[PDB]
Amino acid sequence: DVITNVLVARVDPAQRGDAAVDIRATHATFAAALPVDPAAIVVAMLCGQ
Amino acid sequence: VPRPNGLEPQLIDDGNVPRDIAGDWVYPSDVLQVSVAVFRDYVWPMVKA
Amino acid sequence: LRSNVLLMLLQFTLSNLKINKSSTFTSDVTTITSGRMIRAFEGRPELLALAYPGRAVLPTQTKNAQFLSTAIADRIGRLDRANLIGGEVSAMVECMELCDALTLHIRETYIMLLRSMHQDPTQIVQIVNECANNLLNSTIPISLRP
Amino acid sequence: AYNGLVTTVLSEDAFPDSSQSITHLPSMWKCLFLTLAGPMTSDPHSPVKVFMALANLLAQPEPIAIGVPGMHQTTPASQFSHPGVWPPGFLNPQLIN
Amino acid sequence: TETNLIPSHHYGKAFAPLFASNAMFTRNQRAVITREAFVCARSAVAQCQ
Amino acid sequence: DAGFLVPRPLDALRQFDVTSAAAAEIMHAVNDAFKTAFDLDGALLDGLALYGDPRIADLSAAYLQYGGNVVREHVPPGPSHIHRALQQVESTFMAEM
Amino acid sequence: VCMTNWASLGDEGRGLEVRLPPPTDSSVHAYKTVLSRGYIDNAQFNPLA
Amino acid sequence: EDTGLCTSFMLLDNIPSAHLTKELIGFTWFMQMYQMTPPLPEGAVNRI
């Protein structure tokens, strides 16, 4: 059940002549890949009173 | 079509045959826009008479 | 003569080893073909008239007009744009235009030459890893590439 | 809140590279901070990138075979972003001796 | 050799810039154009012969 | 000519085969009507215009799971009001042109 | 004659109005909105758009 | 890559027609008189 792709159908694929899949499937991730620094997270995790 | 004698110039038909201009004609709008100077010089003076 | 003729046919073939790049297709808004997806050029606008004899205006019964009247209207522009991704460029259009059968055959076997040495990134990530003996980290994204 | 629109995946530069061994100390603290900030992210493949980046570092001391085809234990955590590439030893820890 | 040196990590840093580019595949492209000339130069002579 | 079922009062008017590119310039100026009339800052409806095929039928977002379980959220528009007045204007045009 | 909001007495109004001329003048400049910028002249309309 | 159309056989106008305004008017009809370039060549002999 883990999500491979997230698409937006302008028209249902049964009715989609000249089949045009969403541009979101070009990326590896199903959404926008946002690089986050894990060392900057674990400091914020281990402090924070 | 021009005819190289004292014969009058005659016009092409929907059945692809040259027919004389003198008489009733039907143009569709698509043919009139692509034969404007041909209209104005050959069949339209045969309308002014 | 046999050596000179054979040599210019290799001048003919190697000059034609190109790729038929698709270009922009504009809808024929005017009434000449009325919506056939003709190919505007915009790098040589004179080439549009010679590309498409179906779009010829036939004012008089010219000897060329004796020929060009017989041109069928739906033999122009593209037929099947094999597109895959909306918003991304289509990979392979299929158009009718002025083209000799021989130079097209030289070009279609040149793409077949270039397809003959092409491997998809599932295979070439092994080749780079096996040429590096499985070290030197390599990451292919598992997604579509049209 | 905006998952499916943007995923906060782990950075490429903070994976320990899949040739350094685990005995190298700055490589495992690079993996320690990777594992702690693992569940913080919204990447659904982040459990496997966490598992594989440690498994990159102990390749020869822990030589397990990985059931994904064409791919090995020196394959980095940067690659595993697809569900069919998850190792069956990670899917089933009883396959690991 | 340095004592705390892993051979797999050393060769990763060693072999790094000569797999970054596709210039390794340039000599692989030379093998076709050498072949395509060699078949034709055989065939250009043997048809004139 | 085909696609989504709409009432067609204006069908007697001459119109060539509107392809995907010519429909985008229809979508450019329908959006430019609603941006001018209601004065929206931002972009309400131009992802249909700037890319893709604008010839829509019914928008629906779907996420594909790994086990073949694609689930799709169809979202039809509700009771449209301005279009209900526009269908009056289209049908009134054909007798009062 | 179709002239939108010709008897409007409001505080302001929308900037999107239709003021067709009387039929003694050329009413061609309101039927050039979508597929007519560029090529066409300021006197004719395309019957195909 | 080739942006233009792929042919190698141009349709070259070898011998031009007789331009004339004095006698035998109307036998020939160019497209240049209508500000249009012809798709096909226009002349007596048009060698491929």
Side-chain angles (χ1 to χ4, degrees):
Chain A
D1 54 357
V2 52
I3 304 166
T4 63
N5 295 113
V6 168
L7 274 70
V8 178
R10 300 179 184 274
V11 60
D12 289 331
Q15 294 179 356
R16 184 182 293 170
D18 292 330
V21 190
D22 195 2
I23 192 68
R24 297 182 184 273
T26 304
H27 298 279
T29 62
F30 62 95
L34 179 58
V36 69
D37 185 73
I41 293 174
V42 66
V43 175
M45 288 170 65
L46 291 175
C47 73
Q49 69 272 15
Chain B
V1 323
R3 294 182 292 177
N5 202 359
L7 281 76
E8 64 182 1
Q10 63 184 355
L11 178 58
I12 204 68
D13 196 74
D14 192 73
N16 197 0
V17 57
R19 301 290 187 184
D20 51 355
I21 302 172
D24 46 355
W25 284 91
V26 175
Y27 287 8
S29 177
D30 295 334
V31 177
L32 183 64
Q33 299 183 9
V34 299
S35 67
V36 181
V38 181
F39 185 79
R40 189 178 178 180
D41 291 332
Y42 288 96
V43 48
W44 177 251
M46 201 66 71
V47 169
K48 293 189 287 185
Chain C
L1 183 64
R2 187 172 69 192
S3 180
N4 289 314
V5 165
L6 198 155
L7 194 62
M8 71 154 283
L9 293 177
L10 196 144
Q11 299 287 319
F12 186 80
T13 301
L14 270 67
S15 58
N16 290 319
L17 294 176
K18 292 178 173 67
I19 301 167
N20 289 320
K21 184 181 180 181
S22 176
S23 298
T24 178
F25 286 159
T26 61
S27 296
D28 188 74
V29 187
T30 183
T31 186
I32 305 169
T33 58
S34 71
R36 299 294 296 164
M37 292 294 288
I38 65 170
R39 186 174 65 178
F41 289 93
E42 292 183 355
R44 181 65 65 192
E46 189 179 3
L47 194 63
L48 177 62
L50 281 77
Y52 287 147
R55 293 180 71 249
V57 175
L58 276 70
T60 63
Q61 188 62 40
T62 320
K63 191 179 289 293
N64 288 323
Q66 186 69 41
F67 177 73
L68 293 174
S69 176
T70 320
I72 314 297
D74 55 355
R75 302 287 181 87
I76 194 168
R78 68 174 174 87
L79 282 77
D80 289 331
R81 181 178 292 173
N83 52 1
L84 279 75
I85 306 301
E88 194 176 1
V89 64
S90 177
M92 180 178 72
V93 301
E94 197 275 331
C95 64
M96 292 182 72
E97 64 188 3
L98 184 140
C99 57
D100 50 354
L102 180 57
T103 302
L104 178 60
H105 178 72
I106 300 170
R107 291 168 186 260
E108 291 293 327
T109 189
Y110 182 67
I111 279 93
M112 192 66 209
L113 177 63
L114 266 64
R115 288 289 182 182
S116 178
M117 63 183 79
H118 173 73
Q119 297 295 323
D120 53 351
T122 63
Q123 300 295 320
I124 79 169
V125 73
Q126 293 185 0
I127 295 170
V128 174
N129 287 320
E130 288 177 352
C131 287
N133 292 324
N134 293 319
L135 55 91
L136 191 58
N137 50 1
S138 66
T139 297
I140 51 98
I142 300 169
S143 66
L144 48 83
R145 286 177 175 173
Chain D
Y2 297 105
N3 194 3
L5 184 59
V6 52
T7 60
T8 172
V9 301
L10 292 167
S11 65
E12 295 288 327
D13 294 331
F15 288 167
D17 51 352
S18 67
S19 65
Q20 188 68 262
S21 295
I22 187 165
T23 65
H24 179 73
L25 292 174
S27 180
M28 64 174 287
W29 288 95
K30 193 171 182 178
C31 188
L32 186 146
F33 293 159
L34 192 70
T35 306
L36 289 170
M40 195 69 203
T41 62
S42 69
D43 193 2
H45 305 288
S46 178
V48 188
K49 296 181 181 178
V50 162
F51 174 70
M52 192 60 208
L54 186 62
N56 289 317
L57 299 184
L58 62 80
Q60 194 178 4
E62 317 303 332
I64 195 163
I66 297 173
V68 60
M71 300 175 69
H72 298 90
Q73 195 172 2
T74 63
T75 304
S78 297
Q79 178 75 47
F80 289 183
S81 297
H82 188 75
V85 196
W86 296 3
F90 179 72
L91 295 165
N92 192 2
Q94 293 181 357
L95 297 176
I96 305 175
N97 286 319
Chain E
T1 306
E2 183 67 28
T3 301
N4 53 3
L5 183 62
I6 304 299
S8 68
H9 176 70
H10 184 271
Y11 287 162
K13 296 187 291 185
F15 294 147
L18 47 80
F19 288 103
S21 177
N22 53 2
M24 179 175 69
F25 293 152
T26 302
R27 70 184 61 85
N28 201 1
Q29 290 178 353
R30 292 290 301 272
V32 175
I33 310 300
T34 301
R35 181 191 66 186
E36 296 294 327
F38 180 73
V39 183
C40 290
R42 177 177 289 180
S43 177
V45 171
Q47 287 180 355
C48 293
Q49 193 62 250
Chain F
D1 202 3
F4 184 74
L5 292 174
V6 291
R8 295 180 183 271
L10 297 175
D11 188 74
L13 295 171
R14 182 69 177 89
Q15 175 61 255
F16 64 94
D17 292 331
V18 176
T19 62
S20 178
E25 291 184 354
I26 298 172
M27 190 64 70
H28 283 168
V30 174
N31 189 10
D32 202 3
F34 284 91
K35 286 184 178 180
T36 304
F38 292 97
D39 288 331
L40 274 79
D41 195 1
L44 62 80
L45 184 67
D46 53 355
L48 275 68
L50 294 176
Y51 68 103
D53 293 333
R55 299 175 293 173
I56 59 169
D58 185 74
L59 267 71
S60 66
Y63 63 93
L64 279 76
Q65 295 176 355
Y66 178 75
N69 193 0
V70 49
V71 286
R72 192 179 303 278
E73 292 293 327
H74 296 283
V75 50
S80 180
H81 292 279
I82 296 173
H83 179 72
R84 192 179 68 248
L86 185 64
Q87 286 292 323
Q88 185 64 257
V89 176
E90 295 176 358
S91 180
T92 311
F93 177 76
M94 298 304 292
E96 297 288 323
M97 63 179 70
Chain G
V1 180
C2 178
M3 289 177 68
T4 57
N5 290 318
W6 66 272
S8 179
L9 196 63
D11 50 356
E12 289 294 326
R14 288 178 172 91
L16 190 68
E17 292 181 354
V18 174
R19 301 294 180 91
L20 291 174
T24 60
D25 291 332
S26 67
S27 176
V28 78
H29 64 89
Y31 298 96
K32 297 182 288 185
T33 306
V34 184
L35 295 167
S36 299
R37 293 180 180 178
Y39 63 96
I40 211 163
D41 288 330
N42 55 3
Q44 71 265 15
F45 71 103
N46 192 1
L48 295 180
Chain H
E1 289 172 346
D2 194 1
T3 300
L5 59 99
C6 57
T7 190
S8 297
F9 294 158
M10 71 176 290
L11 277 63
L12 185 62
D13 179 72
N14 198 1
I15 298 300
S17 293
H19 289 171
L20 43 88
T21 59
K22 179 68 176 177
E23 190 178 1
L24 62 80
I25 301 168
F27 284 91
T28 181
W29 292 96
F30 297 99
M31 298 298 171
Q32 184 58 255
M33 67 178 286
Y34 287 157
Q35 291 87 20
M36 186 175 291
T37 60
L40 271 71
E42 287 178 349
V45 176
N46 296 318
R47 296 287 173 184
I48 305 171

